[PDB]
Amino acid sequence: APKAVLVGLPGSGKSTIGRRLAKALGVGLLDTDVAIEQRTGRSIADIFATDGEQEFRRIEEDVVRAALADHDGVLSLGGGAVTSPGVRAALAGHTVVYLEISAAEGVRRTGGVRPLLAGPDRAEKYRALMAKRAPLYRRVATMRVDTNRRNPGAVVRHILSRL
Ligand SMILES: Nc1ncnc2c1ncn2[C@@H]1O[C@H](COP(=O)(O)OP(=O)(O)O)[C@@H](O)[C@H]1O
Ligand SMILES: O=C(O)C1=C[C@@H](O)[C@@H](O)[C@H](O)C1
Ligand SMILES: [Cl-]
Ligand SMILES: [Cl-]
Ligand SMILES: [Cl-]
């Protein structure tokens, strides 16, 4: 089982903190998004525009379950994995770190790709994403970490200390 599973909105820091957390613990980082693009050979943005969410979610879910079982390092899920009921059930019992972030900072971090965030009105879309998913992240989380006024190193240490 992963030493920690990272969840949160896009831009909350799953990929960044996961890497640094991994390097700290001395284990590998498995980023479900990355893993996906491999089992598919295609990019996530292309799977979205070619198969849609329901399909990306089933793939994601299959990767997540596998990772939860075979990966002992740090696991970082895709921003919306928690929307799949199967992913939420598979997480039960695991160490799940919920990286919290405000909508203002979150949107500014994701400035620069995300199929669900992209295009105009990212502030509105980001906020909608938060309203929808906030409840889900909180349900699966065993550890909530506020990343608003904490630089990466501080978030990593805050987590390391509570593991
Ligand atoms: N604690 C933090 N404070 C400052 N910037 C951060 C923090 N965590 C993440 N970032 C930055 O925010 C951007 C998105 O982080 P990323 O790990 O890609 O998010 P996610 O994997 O959740 O989409 C990156 O450029 C990263 O350097
Ligand atoms: O918030 C989401 O639904 C997503 C976030 C990214 O990490 C990727 O998993 C993909 O772009 C979907
Ligand atoms: Cl399983
Ligand atoms: Cl590992
Ligand atoms: Cl299960």
- Tokens 């598919």 correspond to 40
Distance of alpha carbon 92 from alpha carbon 114, whole angstroms: 27
| 67, 35 contact by CB (below 8 A) | yes
Closest to 108 (Cα-Cα) out of 133, 127, 89, 94: 127
Instruction: Sort 21 into a burial class: Cβ within 10 Å, 0-12 / 13-18 / 19+.
Output: buried
Strand partners, 99: 145
Which experimental approach was used here? Answer: X-ray
Tell me, using a 6 A CB cutoff, whether residue 6 lines ligand 2: no
Annotated binding site for ATP: 11-16, 114, 150
Tell me, using a 6 A CB cutoff, whether residue 33 lines ligand 2: yes
Strand partners, 29: 74
- Strands of the sheet containing 74-76, edge to edge, are 29-31, 74-76, 4-7, 96-100, 143-146
- Tokens 């921003």 correspond to 79
Tell me, using a 6 A CB cutoff, whether residue 78 lines ligand 2: yes
Residue 85: CB partners within 8 Å, gap ≥ 6? none
Residue among 31, 64, 76, 116 to mutate when testing ligand 2 (max atoms within 8 A of CB): 116
The resolution of the experimental structure, rounded to one decimal in Å, is 2.2
Count of helices and strands (H, E) across the chain: 8, 5
The number of beta carbons lying within 10 Å of the beta carbon of residue 16 is 18
The number of beta carbons lying within 10 Å of the beta carbon of residue 126 is 23
- Ligand 2, atom 4, lies closest to the CA of 79
Superfamily per CATH, domain 1-163: P-loop containing nucleotide triphosphate hydrolases (3.40.50.300)
Question: What's the residue count for the chain?
Answer: 163
Q: Is 4 helix (H, G, I), strand (E, B) or coil?
A: strand
- Tokens 């065993």 correspond to 142
Q: What is the DSSP string of 21-53?
A: HHHHHT--EEEHHHHHHHHHSS-HHHHHHHH-H
Q: Is 139 helix (H, G, I), strand (E, B) or coil?
A: helix
Q: Which ligand is nearest to the CA of 79?
A: 2
Q: Which ligand is nearest to the CA of 72?
A: 4
Annotated binding site: 11-16, 33, 57, 79, 114, 133, 150
Distance of alpha carbon 74 from alpha carbon 3, whole angstroms: 6
Distance of alpha carbon 63 from alpha carbon 65, whole angstroms: 6
